[PDB]
Design a protein around this ligand. Structure first.
Ligand SMILES: [Cl-]
Length: 183
């Protein structure tokens, strides 16, 4: 049975650096393809970038417990979520699965799919995260303050996850996740 790993952590901890390392290192890694009710942008492929479905069909899927998690996007402009069945099929076939979601999405998946391993990508220190939130200093004080408070709140979620990987270094954070994904 394929392992299913749900990767999350703070907004702006550096998650997507790691994700692409994962996809190069594990050749058959199934990266979950979210369902969405928005329309395709040019170059997007149904089945690959998203599963493009209509709102009504998406509501059926909600109603029938077919989404491991879902959210309203941009205040309900449209919806996106993770379909259960492709993940379960991939795992039954023996292929590893990675699902990248925010913290609310990870919590919802732990209820709908308890055998999924939730992993929190933590910064190596508060100072490392803070330096990246401040960044080039292009944002206002009020926005930065909000970012810092958000980060401290997100960081307190980390104890609920099955595992924590500390993002001390790209190559090892990636390595720890490879070992998780292929046992
Ligand atoms: Cl969790």
């Amino acid at each position: 049975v394929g392992r299913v790993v749900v990767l999350s952590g703070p907004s702006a901890v550096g998650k997507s650096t790691v994700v692409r390392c994962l996809r190069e290192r594990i050749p058959n890694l199934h990266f979950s393809v979210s369902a969405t009710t928005r329309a395709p942008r040019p170059g997007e492929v149904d089945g690959v970038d998203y599963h493009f479905i209509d709102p009504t069909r998406f509501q059926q899927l909600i109603d029938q417990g077919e989404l491991l998690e879902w959210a309203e996007i941009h205040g309900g402009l449209h919806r996106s979520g993770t379909l259960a069945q492709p993940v379960r099929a991939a795992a039954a076939t023996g292929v590893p699965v990675l699902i990248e979601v925010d913290l609310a999405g990870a919590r919802a998946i732990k209820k709908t799919m308890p055998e999924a391993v939730t992993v929190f990508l933590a910064p190596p220190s508060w100072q490392d995260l803070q330096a990246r939130l401040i960044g080039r200093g292009t944002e206002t004080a009020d926005v930065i303050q909000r970012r810092l408070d958000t980060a401290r709140i997100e960081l307190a979620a980390q104890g609920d996850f099955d595992k924590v990987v500390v993002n001390r270094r790209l190559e090892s954070a990636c390595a720890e996740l490879v070992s998780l994904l292929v046992g």
